[PDB]
Amino acid sequence: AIYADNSYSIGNTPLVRLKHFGHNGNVVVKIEGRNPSYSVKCRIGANMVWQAEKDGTLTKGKEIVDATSGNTGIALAYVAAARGYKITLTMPETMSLERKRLLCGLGVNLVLTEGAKGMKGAIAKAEEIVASDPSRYVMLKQFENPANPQIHRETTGPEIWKDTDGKVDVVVAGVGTGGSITGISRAIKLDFGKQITSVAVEPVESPVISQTLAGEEVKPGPHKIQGIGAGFIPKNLDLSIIDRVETVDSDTALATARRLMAEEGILAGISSGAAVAAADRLAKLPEFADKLIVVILPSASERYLSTALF
C-alpha cells in the first residue's frame, strides 16, 4: 500500500538469475540497488534511526552524527530528511564524488577534515562534535549498532528465504560492517533452521578476516572495492556464523561489475562485482554445482561513474 515516509519503503528487492555466471543458473543475485536511496544501507539507515527513536536516544532537537564515508551516509541522509532530523556526516576527501555530491543535495552538514585524508580523522572529528552538548548529538555507529544486523535478520533474510521458497543453499555477501551476512545468516540458520553456507567476501588486498581466522598476522591494505574491506574486524560481523571466506582482487571485481552490465544488463557496483566473482568461483565447484547460491548486490553502478568502473 502507501508508506508513511520513504524510510518505510525499504527492502523487498528482487532475485534475478544469472546466465553468464555459475552453472546452469545456480547463481541468483539480490539487487539491493532497488532501495529508497539505492543501496543496501537504506535498511540500516532506517532501522538505526527507528531504534534510536524507540530507545529515546533520538528525539526532536537532537542531531545525528556518524562517519560512514559511503552509502550509509546517503541512507542516514534520506532518512533524516524524511523524518525531520538535522544530520552531520564526517569525511575527509573524497571518494567517491557522487557520494560527496548527493549528501550536499540531501542537506547534511558535511564536515570535511584530513588526518591523512582518513576515517581516523573523520571518526575523531565525529567524537569531537559529539563532545559538545552530547545530549544534542547522537552517534549511531553502524559498525557496532545491533539494529544494523537486526534489520537484515528481519527483512533481507526472510525475503531471500521467501523468494527462494526455502531452497537457498548458499549466501554470498561482501563484508563492510558485517551486518548483511550476519543478519541474513542468523535469519536463515536460526529462525528458519536451514544449515546453509554463509560466505563472507573481502578484498585480497586487505584480507583481515582470513588472516585472523587463520591465526596469521593481520595486515590491512588499500583497495578499490568500495563498501567492503574495512581493514578491521567490525563488531557487527558475527564470525561464528561465517562458514567460509573468499578473497577477490580489485581488478577482477571491477571486470566482474562491467561483465554484469554488458552481459547481464545489470547495473551493479564494484563490491557487487566482487561478490559475484567469489560466488562464481564457488558455483563452478562440483561441491556447489547443484546448490542454489544467493549473492547480495549492495549498490548501483551509477554511484561509481567517477571511479575506475567507467
Binding site: G118, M119, I123, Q142, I225, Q226, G229, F232
Partner: peptide, 8 residues
C-alpha cells in the same frame, strides 16, 4: 582507494 572504514 579505501582502508580503515572508508567508503562504507
Amino acid at each position: 582507494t579505501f582502508e580503515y572504514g572508508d567508503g562504507i
